[PDB]
Amino acid sequence: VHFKDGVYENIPFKVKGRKTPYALSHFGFFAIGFAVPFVACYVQLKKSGAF
Amino acid sequence: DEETFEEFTARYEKEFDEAYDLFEVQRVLNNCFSYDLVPAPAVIEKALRAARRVNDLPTAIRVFEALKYKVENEDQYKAYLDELKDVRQELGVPLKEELFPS
Amino acid sequence: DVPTPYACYFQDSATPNQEGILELHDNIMFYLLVILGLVSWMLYTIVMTYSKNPIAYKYIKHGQTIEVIWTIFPAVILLIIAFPSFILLYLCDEVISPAMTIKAIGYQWYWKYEYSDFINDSGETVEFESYVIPDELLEEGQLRLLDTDTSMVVPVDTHIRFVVTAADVIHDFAIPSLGIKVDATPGRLNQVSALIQREGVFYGACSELCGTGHANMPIKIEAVSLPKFLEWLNEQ
Amino acid sequence: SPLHTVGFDARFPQQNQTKHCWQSYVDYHKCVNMKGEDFAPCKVFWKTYNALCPLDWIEKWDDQREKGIFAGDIN
Amino acid sequence: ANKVIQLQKIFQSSTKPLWWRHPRSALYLYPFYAIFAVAVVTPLLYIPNAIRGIKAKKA
Amino acid sequence: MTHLERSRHQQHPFHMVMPSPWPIVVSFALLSLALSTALTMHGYIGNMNMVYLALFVLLTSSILWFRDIVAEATYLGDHTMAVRKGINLGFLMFVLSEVLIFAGLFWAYFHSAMSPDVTLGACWPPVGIEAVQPTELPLLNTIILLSSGATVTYSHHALIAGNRNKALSGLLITFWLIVIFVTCQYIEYTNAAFTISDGVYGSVFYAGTGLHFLHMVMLAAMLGVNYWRMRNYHLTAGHHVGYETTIIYTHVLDVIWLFLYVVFYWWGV
Amino acid sequence: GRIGESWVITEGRRLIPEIFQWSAVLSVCLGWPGAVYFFSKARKA
Amino acid sequence: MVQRWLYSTNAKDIAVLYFMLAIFSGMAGTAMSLIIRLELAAPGSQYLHGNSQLFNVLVVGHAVLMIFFLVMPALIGGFGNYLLPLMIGATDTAFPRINNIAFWVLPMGLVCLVTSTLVESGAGTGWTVYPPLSSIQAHSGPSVDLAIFALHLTSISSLLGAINFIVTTLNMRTNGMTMHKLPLFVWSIFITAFLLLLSLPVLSAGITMLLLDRNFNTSFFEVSGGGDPILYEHLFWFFGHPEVYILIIPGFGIISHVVSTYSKKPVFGEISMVYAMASIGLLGFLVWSHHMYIVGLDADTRAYFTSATMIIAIPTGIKIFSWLATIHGGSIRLATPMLYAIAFLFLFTMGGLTGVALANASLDVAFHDTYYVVGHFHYVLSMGAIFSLFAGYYYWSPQILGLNYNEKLAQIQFWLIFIGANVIFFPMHFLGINGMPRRIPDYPDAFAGWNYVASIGSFIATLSLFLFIYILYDQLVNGLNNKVNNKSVIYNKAPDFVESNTIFNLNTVKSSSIEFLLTSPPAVHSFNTPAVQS
Numbered sequence A: 001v002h003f004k005d006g007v008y009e010n011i012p013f014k015v016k017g018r019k020t021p022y023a024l025s026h027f028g029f030f031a032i033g034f035a036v037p038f039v040a041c042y043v044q045l046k047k048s049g050a051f
Numbered sequence B: 001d002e003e004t005f006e007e008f009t010a011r012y013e014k015e016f017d018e019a020y021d022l023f024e025v026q027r028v029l030n031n032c033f034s035y036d037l038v039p040a041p042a043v044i045e046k047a048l049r050a051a052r053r054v055n056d057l058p059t060a061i062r063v064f065e066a067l068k069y070k071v072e073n074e075d076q077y078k079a080y081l082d083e084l085k086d087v088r089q090e091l092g093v094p095l096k097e098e099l100f101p102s
Numbered sequence C: 001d002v003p004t005p006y007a008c009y010f011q012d013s014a015t016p017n018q019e020g021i022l023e024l025h026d027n028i029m030f031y032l033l034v035i036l037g038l039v040s041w042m043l044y045t046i047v048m049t050y051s052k053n054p055i056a057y058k059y060i061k062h063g064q065t066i067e068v069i070w071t072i073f074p075a076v077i078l079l080i081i082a083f084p085s086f087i088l089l090y091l092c093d094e095v096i097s098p099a100m101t102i103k104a105i106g107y108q109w110y111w112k113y114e115y116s117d118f119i120n121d122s123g124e125t126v127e128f129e130s131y132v133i134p135d136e137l138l139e140e141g142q143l144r145l146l147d148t149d150t151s152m153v154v155p156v157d158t159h160i161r162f163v164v165t166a167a168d169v170i171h172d173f174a175i176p177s178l179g180i181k182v183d184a185t186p187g188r189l190n191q192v193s194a195l196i197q198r199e200g201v202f203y204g205a206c207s208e209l210c211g212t213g214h215a216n217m218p219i220k221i222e223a224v225s226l227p228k229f230l231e232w233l234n235e236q
Numbered sequence D: 001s002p003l004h005t006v007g008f009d010a011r012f013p014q015q016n017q018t019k020h021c022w023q024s025y026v027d028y029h030k031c032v033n034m035k036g037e038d039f040a041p042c043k044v045f046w047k048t049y050n051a052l053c054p055l056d057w058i059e060k061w062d063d064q065r066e067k068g069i070f071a072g073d074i075n
Numbered sequence E: 001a002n003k004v005i006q007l008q009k010i011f012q013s014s015t016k017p018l019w020w021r022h023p024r025s026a027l028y029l030y031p032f033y034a035i036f037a038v039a040v041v042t043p044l045l046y047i048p049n050a051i052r053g054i055k056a057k058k059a
Numbered sequence F: 001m002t003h004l005e006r007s008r009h010q011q012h013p014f015h016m017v018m019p020s021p022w023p024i025v026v027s028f029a030l031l032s033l034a035l036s037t038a039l040t041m042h043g044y045i046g047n048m049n050m051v052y053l054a055l056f057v058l059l060t061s062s063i064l065w066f067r068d069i070v071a072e073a074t075y076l077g078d079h080t081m082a083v084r085k086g087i088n089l090g091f092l093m094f095v096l097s098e099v100l101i102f103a104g105l106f107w108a109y110f111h112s113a114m115s116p117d118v119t120l121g122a123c124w125p126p127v128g129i130e131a132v133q134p135t136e137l138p139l140l141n142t143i144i145l146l147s148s149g150a151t152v153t154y155s156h157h158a159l160i161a162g163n164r165n166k167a168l169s170g171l172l173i174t175f176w177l178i179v180i181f182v183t184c185q186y187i188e189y190t191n192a193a194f195t196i197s198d199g200v201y202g203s204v205f206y207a208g209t210g211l212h213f214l215h216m217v218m219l220a221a222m223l224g225v226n227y228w229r230m231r232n233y234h235l236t237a238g239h240h241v242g243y244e245t246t247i248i249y250t251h252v253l254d255v256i257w258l259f260l261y262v263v264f265y266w267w268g269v
Numbered sequence G: 001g002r003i004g005e006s007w008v009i010t011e012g013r014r015l016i017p018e019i020f021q022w023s024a025v026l027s028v029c030l031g032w033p034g035a036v037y038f039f040s041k042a043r044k045a
Numbered sequence H: 001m002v003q004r005w006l007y008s009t010n011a012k013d014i015a016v017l018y019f020m021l022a023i024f025s026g027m028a029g030t031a032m033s034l035i036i037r038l039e040l041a042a043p044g045s046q047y048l049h050g051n052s053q054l055f056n057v058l059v060v061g062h063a064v065l066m067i068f069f070l071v072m073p074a075l076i077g078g079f080g081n082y083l084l085p086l087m088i089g090a091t092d093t094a095f096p097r098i099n100n101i102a103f104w105v106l107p108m109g110l111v112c113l114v115t116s117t118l119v120e121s122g123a124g125t126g127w128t129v130y131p132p133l134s135s136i137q138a139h140s141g142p143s144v145d146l147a148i149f150a151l152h153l154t155s156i157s158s159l160l161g162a163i164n165f166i167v168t169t170l171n172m173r174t175n176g177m178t179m180h181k182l183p184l185f186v187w188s189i190f191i192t193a194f195l196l197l198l199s200l201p202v203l204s205a206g207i208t209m210l211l212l213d214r215n216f217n218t219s220f221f222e223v224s225g226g227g228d229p230i231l232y233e234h235l236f237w238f239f240g241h242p243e244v245y246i247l248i249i250p251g252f253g254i255i256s257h258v259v260s261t262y263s264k265k266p267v268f269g270e271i272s273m274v275y276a277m278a279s280i281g282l283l284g285f286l287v288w289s290h291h292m293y294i295v296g297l298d299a300d301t302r303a304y305f306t307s308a309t310m311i312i313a314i315p316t317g318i319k320i321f322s323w324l325a326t327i328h329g330g331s332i333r334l335a336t337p338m339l340y341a342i343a344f345l346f347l348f349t350m351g352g353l354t355g356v357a358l359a360n361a362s363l364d365v366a367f368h369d370t371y372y373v374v375g376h377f378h379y380v381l382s383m384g385a386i387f388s389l390f391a392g393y394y395y396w397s398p399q400i401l402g403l404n405y406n407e408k409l410a411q412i413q414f415w416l417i418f419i420g421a422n423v424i425f426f427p428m429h430f431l432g433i434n435g436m437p438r439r440i441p442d443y444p445d446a447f448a449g450w451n452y453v454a455s456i457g458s459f460i461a462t463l464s465l466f467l468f469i470y471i472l473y474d475q476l477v478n479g480l481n482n483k484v485n486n487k488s489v490i491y492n493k494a495p496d497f498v499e500s501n502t503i504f505n506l507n508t509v510k511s512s513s514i515e516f517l518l519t520s521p522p523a524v525h526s527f528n529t530p531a532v533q534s
């Protein structure tokens, strides 16, 4: 299949010409990664009765 | 690679006479200063007469600048400037210290 | 015998096996310091001089003399320290003419000790369990996560055979100052030997992840004199 | 010194000592099955399997012999 | 019988995706997609009980 | 063919596969299988109906992937000499990996048998275990397998030579010989006096010979695929790659079973 | 013969300053935990 | 858009998905190591309320994410899938649909490992998962099953990708390129693909047999049925050691390219570098029981494994001296990739010399489950493989993306991780030699000193990772401006001494591999008429 060429064309995410700022996508994506260990801790400390 | 020093000069003397434009004179000069030796005075003279034939003055200035990097002492730099005295004078080539004096 | 704050070395030795382990560590570190001195120096004096070299030596691509020489040199060093490392391996594996045997069994977060030589005046098996003293029950001056409610008592200058196993999962009998470390596997019996040269208390810990209580299962050993051991043995 | 225990045996010279216990227990019970329970040098086996073998192991093998489930070949 | 050449010209002159060119391909692809949806959703609808420790009452 | 016409064709022989949905649909069936089996093994799901559905969807989704490789080679002409050579080399590296899976099962057997544990009786086999005798139904199986590596040899060489009937008969016989092997192991299983629950012996025995049982069911499915393709004129006298991969498969499984029969049946009994 | 000063003097002038700069770097990479213990309560009271 | 990224058969697009997933996973594994280092800061319960099972759960999650979900999908799934076809002239990979399934099993293996920590109590077993601690008596419920299925899905991924890497290298080279003419990075992915092919099937036997004991009443490792726990360790470690080399060799090939580019010299003794990489990959199958020195093996078994482990130091030291020989007499250019490569040569040597002490079985009695071991393998995995991963990104991303990065911001990032990594792991050797066990949430009070120092460095290094996340943002929003202002490096090679500024503009690139000769973002149809070499 024929695709396009250029600078922002070989990535799956949109960086330019978007309504919402790209900062919400960039740092929201890496925030969710950093936040999954804390969700696990919350569930397990809420099972031991610590909370 | 077993090449004696005498074979080194006789091969790069032949290589400076065949260079036909600026790209060739700069490419041959780059490879001549990339060994573990300082080229003989008779090789430096043929590199100056090759840059005259392509009409380029900065390449002839850079020849003596590389010479002062490659020697071991400053008295080895002087003895070259005392052998190539006429040629630097006959073609009108200045030294980089003489051109931008500090 | 006990760890100390900001310590950067072995705990003091009480057996000839731990004397020899330390001797081999120091012998090896003599040669690892020559090698680190070379590599760090060549790295430093290459960046400082060739980051300011305007003409690269692009025609140097191999050397027969140096490449053979630097293939042989690491083999000589490696062979020099393998000689005492083989001798220590066979000197610690031998258990010849011991005078007493003690069994140690690991459980889900306590130890257990059994004496079955029947030397005591009534000829039974002496056995007890050893538990860490809980934090709520500590008396002021006792050591957290180290002191136990009962300890193992052995005599000095006596060759001892230790027999180690387990009941539920894998544990590990380990005392740093005696040169002892051996897994405790459900199903088999391993053995180790010791000979203590001075009196005192020696502390250890479990060394095979065994679940939630892996940190609460310490080992404490007291070495006393021979008349003192017979009195303790004949009572407990 | 009044201390004595079993010594080095050339059949079992390695760190693994599992078979040393089990063979002394097996030899002892078959020594009393034909030469009688009481035998001066039949106590040699009894000392060795007691010295270096867990009390919970002996407890299990005794119960198995009662039901005829001991896997050792003693009869 | 032999139908290699006839299918060879149907396939090579078709605009549709590869898995759609055969005239019989509708009968496989329609029911597979429905079955594929049930087989993916249903295990996911059980993780809430697994976290909450509720077990099925097959008794 | 001038320069104008040569421009309408590729300059390299390699295959440019169009985008397909199958690789990401197989991955979802793999996760649905993993999530269902763990949940039913522990009671969170009442029965085995959801595990059945996940196995059915992993199966019919690989079929469609295989269906798209038939069309790219029979109706499109995309399998040139270089594409053919790469396919053969990928299959040899697949079987080398599967062979080392059995190599790990032979380690576990020898670890348990050379110095047997005392709770067994310090004897191999353990006391009370009645094992399978070699000169029996397992000896009929080793002959049935050796007999199919020579009827598959003359079918392959009858296709190169252009004989159709002889080719079609030497494959219909290899099919029913692997089928006979499969039901013969079924009889040998429902009659054995021990179970996979019977300690470490019933674990290493049924693992080594039970994995081999599963490959044979896969091997009989491959000879049925070749049968449809050879009878319906897909395979030609010089271009039959789906057939050579099957042939190499029947010969490695023959050697593996030979090893199982010498270790699990003659030496270990 | 040889023109200029001996190669020992020329090379000596270039390496002696670098020996001291090497030993002052490797001491920082390997001796920095010694400074933490210097300002501790456990040390020398 | 849907069918370009869910139906993909292009090797460059798939390699971008790999890197996206790899970097999202290093976030989680770094967050777990930060929670771990906060609970180890001081004696007593600190942040987890005395839940020791939870502390053990986070340690398994930390190791699995860093190894199987960050370093393997980035060094191999990312750089291997992107640069190997371009360096040999291939128009694609062999088997493009196999190449796509080997990515889409990793997202499904993450929604198996994450749901494993949320169900019942999680798996508090260690990343080696020894039985009987991991059997149904000592670990009930479905947590250890869901972790095994996660490991199964990463094995399908790495095996399928390895079969694809091997066929592509042997079958699809371009005109004139013979196996003696391959770039050194291509050799490093080729040899790694063979270690994966011969070690992964032994691990799949071990952990499937562990699943059978738990759920199907089987006695491979159960002691009441005759089984043996020590069998599992033989089967697990026969895959383990080959794995650590599956993690360093691709980084050996990256280091070769970077060091040669920023010296303007070819790699010294290039042919003996391939022979050394093959010798290390072969000797990594004969040394596995140095991980079982105290479980009761025979004394003659232990003397063999001592000498087998030591002799892997000879081929590795050839690669160390070879790298120092190419930078000697060079013209060094200290861009950001060159900084990591020089730190790799110094920090990998230190980690490898503490392994030589561990190689002797007599000395390993004082080095078992000791923090001293933890200090060894974080010097070769976190100042080793991780430093080579940074060196790669700064080396190839401007070409791959068409966007430049802020140079002086990147040198701040390098110094913050070099300082902070040393602070975490250097005192770990002091704790171990004095006798501190590993895998404990709590310790005696005499170990408080060095444990406080290491927890501080853990904050320094996490700040350096957050600066790297901003550098990615700046490159993606301001990458085109970084080329016209003076905030980034344009040329990784500068003009030669006698080469003038305008002659240099005739040939800007002087490269011994194809990849720097393409368009900046390489075309989706990169070769039509095949490339040709002499």
Ligand code: HEA
Binding pocket: H023, H025, H026, H027, H030, H033, H036, H037, H059, H060, H062, H063, H066, H067, H071, H074, H126, H127, H128, H374, H378, H381, H382, H386, H389, H390, H393, H421, H424, H438, H439, H440, H458, H461, H462, H465
């Ligand atoms: C890939 C391997 C890897 C990496 C990188 C790390 C990184 C770190 N590890 Fe760990 N660790 C292991 C592998 C690794 N570790 C293993 C196998 C174990 C043993 C498990 C066991 O005991 O069961 C272990 C155990 C372990 C323990 C033992 C806990 C205990 O025994 O219970 C501790 C304790 O502090 C620790 C700390 C750290 C720290 C502080 C870092 C941090 O310093 C990290 C520093 C640097 C970074 C912040 C990472 C870079 C960030 C990226 C996302 C890279 C992105 C790059 C690009 C894409 C270009 N690790």
Ligand code: HEA
Binding pocket: C035, C039, C073, C074, C075, C077, C078, H244, H245, H247, H248, H290, H291, H309, H310, H312, H313, H314, H316, H317, H318, H320, H348, H349, H351, H352, H353, H355, H356, H358, H359, H360, H364, H367, H368, H369, H373, H376, H377, H380, H381, H384, H385
């Ligand atoms: C990148 C990963 C990686 C690499 C490359 C290595 C490399 C080496 N490792 Fe390591 N190792 C691990 C990852 C790694 N390791 C992990 C994760 C563990 C713990 C697993 C766990 O328990 O969870 C571990 C644990 C481990 C053990 C088990 C110890 C124990 O658990 O008790 C041993 C045993 O010998 C070992 C030794 C070695 C040796 C000799 C090398 C050698 O290859 C090093 C050779 C390199 C050099 C020697 C440097 C340069 C050489 C020269 C300059 C030559 C001149 C030198 C001389 C003459 C001496 N390490």
Ligand SMILES: CCCCCCCCCCCCCCCC(=O)OC[C@H](COP(=O)(O)OCCN)OC(=O)CCCCCCCCCCCCCCC
Binding pocket: A011, A012, A013, A014, A015, A018, A019, A020, A024, A025, A026, A029, H015, H016, H019, H020, H078, H079, H082, H397, H400, H401, H472
């Ligand atoms: C949440 C915003 C929704 C806004 C609502 C829409 C209203 C209109 C606004 C217009 C925005 C449209 C939103 C579409 C989604 C979107 O463009 O960004 C949203 C995307 C998500 O989507 P995804 O496709 O990447 O898939 C992923 C979904 N799980 O974030 C991101 O990945 C940020 C990722 C950036 C980090 C990657 C950095 C790697 C750089 C490449 C380097 C590669 C090196 C390779 C070397 C081998």
Ligand SMILES: CCCCCCCCCCCCCCCC(=O)OC[C@H](COP(=O)(O)OCCN)OC(=O)CCCCCCCCCCCCCCC
Binding pocket: C004, C005, C006, C007, C008, C009, C032, C033, C036, G030, G031, G033, G034, G037, H350, H351, H353, H354, H426, H429, H430, H433
């Ligand atoms: C990369 C891994 C390197 C391995 C290093 C592991 C450790 C090996 C043993 C080192 C012994 C340290 C001497 C103890 C001094 C002391 O006595 O310490 C004294 C105090 C506290 O002592 P104190 O008050 O408790 O009691 C005793 C009071 N006198 O501490 C310190 O000053 C810390 C200073 C750190 C020491 C620098 C270490 C340099 C060694 C470099 C090794 C190079 C590696 C070689 C190649 C691998």
Ligand SMILES: CCCCCCCCCCCCCCCC(=O)OC[C@H](COP(=O)(O)OCCN)OC(=O)CCCCCCCCCCCCCCC
Binding pocket: F101, F189, F190, F191, F192, F193, F194, F195, F196, F197, F206, F207, F208, F210, F211, F214, H152, H204, H205, H206, H208, H209, H216
């Ligand atoms: C990822 C790579 C895979 C690595 C695999 C390593 C280990 C595999 C060895 C086990 C393979 C299955 C053994 C055959 C079944 C058997 O055991 O035979 C059947 C046995 C014998 O019947 P019986 O006990 O009633 O006695 C007969 C007395 N009348 O019954 C059982 O077991 C019942 C339990 C069912 C066992 C199914 C286990 C499935 C899990 C593994 C799935 C296969 C692995 C993947 C293969 C593609």
Ligand SMILES: CCCCCCCCCCCCCCCC(=O)OC[C@H](COP(=O)(O)OCCN)OC(=O)CCCCCCCCCCCCCCC
Binding pocket: F055, F058, F059, F062, F066, F069, F070, F073, F074, F079, F087, F218, F221, F222, F225, F234, F235, F236, F239, F240, F241, F242, F243, F245
């Ligand atoms: C429970 C779910 C389990 C699902 C597993 C089902 C497995 C059953 C086996 C069915 C195989 C059908 C293949 C026919 C495709 C075909 O058409 O191959 C023929 C093609 C066409 O070439 P031609 O020569 O015919 O040219 C015609 C004249 N021009 O060549 C090839 O592609 C060769 C490659 C075939 C390799 C198939 C894959 C084998 C390994 C798969 C293993 C998967 C399970 C592994 C588990 C451990």
Ligand SMILES: CCCCCCCCCCCCCCCC(=O)OC[C@H](COP(=O)(O)OCCN)OC(=O)CCCCCCCCCCCCCCC
Binding pocket: G027, G028, G029, G031, G032, G033, G034, G035, G036, G037, G038, G039, G040, G041, G042, H418, H419, H422, H423, H452, H453, H456, H457
């Ligand atoms: C290669 C990389 C090298 C990087 C250099 C390291 C510097 C980065 C920052 C390091 C963090 C410091 C941890 C302090 C933890 C703490 O709280 O210290 C506590 C100690 C007191 O102890 P306390 O018991 O009272 O604690 C009570 C707990 N509540 O106070 C200090 O000692 C102050 C710190 C001393 C400063 C030294 C820093 C190292 C610089 C080295 C300079 C070169 C030295 C050369 C010697 C030959």
Ligand SMILES: CCCCCCCCCCCCCCCC(=O)OC[C@H](COP(=O)(O)OCCN)OC(=O)CCCCCCCCCCCCCCC
Binding pocket: F015, F017, F026, F062, F065, F066, F069, F072, F087, F090, F091, F094, H094, H095, H096, H097, H098, H099, H156, H159
């Ligand atoms: C849990 C139970 C275990 C399940 C096993 C995992 C199942 C995942 C795969 C499901 C099967 C779908 C078919 C995909 C395979 C395929 O189609 O191979 C066919 C590919 C197609 O090539 P192409 O389309 O890429 O190129 C386009 C050219 N026409 O021919 C090849 O590559 C040649 C080499 C064959 C090697 C196949 C290997 C078999 C894959 C399974 C490997 C599993 C290893 C782990 C063992 C436990």
Ligand code: CUA
Binding pocket: C106, C109, C170, C171, C172, C206, C207, C208, C209, C210, C211, C213, C214, C215, C217
């Ligand atoms: Cu017992 Cu850890």
Ligand SMILES: [Ca+2]
Binding pocket: H039, H040, H041, H042, H043, H044, H045, H046, H441, H442, H443
């Ligand atoms: Ca704490």
Ligand SMILES: [Cu+2]
Binding pocket: H240, H241, H244, H288, H290, H291
């Ligand atoms: Cu190892």
Ligand SMILES: [Mg+2]
Binding pocket: C207, C208, H369
């Ligand atoms: Mg251990």
